[PDB]
Design a protein around this ligand. Structure first.
Ligand SMILES: COc1ccc(CC[C@H]2OC(=O)[C@@H]3CCCCN3C(=O)[C@@H](C3CCCCC3)c3cc(OC)c(c(OC)c3)OC[C@H](O)[C@H](O)COc3cccc2c3)cc1OC
Length: 128
C-alpha cells in the first residue's frame, strides 16, 4: 500500500486542524465503541516511510502491539488516530513529521521531516 501520489486523500482528524494526520478507512469496524484516553489498546499494524525505504509490521513477529492510549508511548499520530477507531476497523494514516519524528528524525531508521504511512487494525481495548 502507499499514499496517493498527487493529492492527499484522507480526513483531517487533528484537534489543531493542521492536516498533520489524515485518515482513510480501509475496513469499517464491527464495534460501536471508540477507545478512551487511558485505555489499553491492542492493534496490528504495518508502517513505512511514505517513499517505501523502511517497513515494519507487528505481523513480522505475529505479536500484537499493545499500548496505553494517550500516554505518549507512541508517536502523536497513533494516539490521535487510534482514538478515532472502532473494534475491527482498519485505517490508513498519512502522518506528517509533527505527528511522528519531526525535524530531528530518528536516524538511522527515520530521516528528518519524514511523512509516514501506517495501516492499523484495532483488535480490542479495555479501560486500565
Ligand atoms: C511521543 O512520541 C514518540 C513516542 C515513542 C517513540 C518511539 C518509537 C515508537 O514507534 C512508534 O510510535 C511507531 C508506531 C508504533 C509502531 C512502531 N512505530 C514506528 O514508527 C516504527 C517505524 C515505522 C516506519 C518504518 C520504520 C519503523 C518503529 C518500529 C520499531 O521497532 C518495531 C522501532 C522504531 O524506532 C524508531 C520505530 O524500534 C524501536 C525499538 O528498537 C523497539 O523495536 C520498540 O519499538 C517501539 C516500541 C514502542 C514505541 C515505539 C517503538 C517516538 C516518539 O516520537 C518521536
Amino acid at each position: 500500500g502507499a499514499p496517493a501520489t498527487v493529492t492527499e486523500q484522507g480526513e483531517d482528524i487533528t484537534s489543531k486542524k493542521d492536516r498533520g494526520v489524515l485518515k482513510i478507512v480501509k475496513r469499517v469496524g464491527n464495534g460501536e465503541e471508540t477507545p478512551m484516553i487511558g485505555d489499553k489498546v491492542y492493534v496490528h499494524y504495518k508502517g513505512k516511510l511514505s517513499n517505501g525505504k523502511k517497513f515494519d509490521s507487528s505481523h513480522d513477529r505475529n505479536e500484537p502491539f499493545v499500548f496505553s492510549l494517550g500516554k505518549g508511548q507512541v508517536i502523536k499520530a497513533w494516539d490521535i488516530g487510534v482514538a478515532t477507531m472502532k473494534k475491527g476497523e482498519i485505517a490508513h494514516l498519512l502522518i506528517k513529521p509533527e505527528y511522528a519524528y519531526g525535524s530531528a528524525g530518528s536516524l538511522p531508521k527515520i530521516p528528518s521531516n519524514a511523512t509516514l504511512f501506517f495501516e492499523i487494525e484495532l483488535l480490542d481495548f479495555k479501560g486500565e
